[PDB]
Design an enzyme around this catalytic site. Structure first.
Site, short mmCIF file in Angstrom:
data_model
loop_
_atom_site.label_atom_id
_atom_site.label_comp_id
_atom_site.label_asym_id
_atom_site.label_seq_id
_atom_site.Cartn_x
_atom_site.Cartn_y
_atom_site.Cartn_z
N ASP B 13 -10.50 22.91 26.32
CA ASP B 13 -10.33 21.91 25.28
C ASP B 13 -11.51 22.00 24.32
OD1 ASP B 13 -9.07 19.24 24.20
OD2 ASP B 13 -11.20 18.80 24.51
N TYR B 117 -4.50 24.65 17.46
CA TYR B 117 -5.83 24.07 17.29
C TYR B 117 -6.91 24.83 18.06
CZ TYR B 117 -9.21 20.41 16.25
OH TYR B 117 -10.29 19.70 15.77
N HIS B 176 -10.20 12.09 25.29
CA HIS B 176 -10.85 12.59 24.07
C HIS B 176 -12.32 12.93 24.28
CE1 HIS B 176 -7.33 10.18 22.78
NE2 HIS B 176 -7.14 11.20 21.97
N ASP B 181 -10.30 15.60 29.00
CA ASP B 181 -9.01 16.15 28.60
C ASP B 181 -8.63 17.37 29.43
OD1 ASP B 181 -8.62 14.18 26.77
OD2 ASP B 181 -8.98 15.42 24.99
#
Lengths: 217, 217
Positions: B13, B117, B176, B181
């Site tokens: 992440d 992303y 977050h 995450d």
């Protein structure tokens, strides 16, 4: 202050195949780097700082884990081999140094009973690889000695669980896993953060003065 | 299988200063390497495997975080600078590669919305350093695409929190933050582990085919 103010505290824990006299080898390690800013502010357990660097790794030892070691850590050489873990090698040493290079200097490793176990063992693994001065830029303190001085400044056991339970009224969550022991040590060091930083700055010891548990010196 | 069986799943992440169109820069990253062995076995959340490698790092971006980014991640360029965080540099790239080299190959990065992303952003940071092929040895999958296929094989949102809540009846703990995450994504991927591994093996995509979000291609 012998070496100035320490900027980053890297809380460290090593799990191994056995006790010092058995020539133990690392099975798991955790490094949690906390900048000094994060320690400059019945009771609840303090929350860990938002900004932290963390590294937790399992290592395949060149020998079998003792039954007590497997009982305590939940690790064994067969389990580590089933997950394809690699031995302590040059790549691991480069990884540890690259992790420390993310942190502002001076670095100060912090480990519970580190003077008798974690620091000599880490030096021994580095010495076997011939990387005798790989982490010489770092400093180190034993948090057993630190917490003794803090509590006495205001018979007790000064094990990790004894101090944690004495301060917060419960046992630490993940006992005897490298990351769990590091997080419990962080929570205890957050008890009196300013007093800890004063003691760490005055007792910071160059990691190069740590004699290896075994191997060339 | 296009590239054989993946041996290590590295859940990933990235947190950043903003959205893709704003040319964002990484503020935090977490890598959690889980060997395939650990995924070969109302309901309770599955416990993470005992043997895992973990790396969590905060990064100083070369620009300001958007208000929404700071609101969501709890990070800001000032907070990161107060803790002496370093920018995305060669040392960080060497650190990431050394971390992956601890894992048996083939490597497969796993990231929620990674195709849009996390993967392009990581490629963009590497491209700015000229390390365009640094992580070319790895593969990658988007766990949004994976979990869609798993649930449909038996309208829903397929965000991280929506899937987690739909499966386990509660929201993930540390939302977050990079590590929180990743741990929530691991728990979801442990829902149907064997079905996930079959899908990952068939859809593993070479990381070199990921176009960078910005920078040289």
């Amino acid at each position: 202050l012998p070496h100035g103010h320490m900027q980053t505290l890297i809380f460290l824990d090593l799990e191994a195949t056995g006790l010092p006299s058995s020539r133990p080898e690392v099975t798991e390690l955790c490094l949690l780097a906390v900048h000094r800013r994060a320690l400059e502010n019945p009771p609840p357990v303090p929350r860990p700082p938002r900004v932290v660097d963390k590294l937790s790794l399992c290592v395949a030892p060149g020998k079998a884990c003792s039954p007590a070691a497997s009982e305590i850590t939940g690790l064994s050489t067969a389990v580590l081999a089933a997950h394809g873990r690699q031995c302590f090698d040059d790549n691991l040493a480069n990884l540890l140094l690259a992790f420390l290079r993310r942190q502002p200097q001076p670095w100060c490793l912090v480990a519970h009973n580190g003077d008798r176990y974690d620091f000599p063992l880490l030096q021994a693994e580095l010495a076997m690889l011939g990387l005798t001065s790989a982490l010489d830029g770092a400093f180190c303190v034993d948090s057993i000695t630190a917490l003794k001085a803090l509590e006495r400044a205001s018979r007790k056991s000064y094990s990790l669980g004894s101090i944690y339970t004495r301060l917060y009224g419960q046992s630490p969550p993940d006992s005897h896993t490298a990351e769990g022991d590091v997080l419990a040590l962080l929570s205890i060091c957050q008890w009196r953060p300013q007093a800890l930083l004063r003691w760490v700055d005055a007792h910071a010891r160059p990691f190069g003065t740590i004699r290896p548990m075994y191997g060339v010196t």
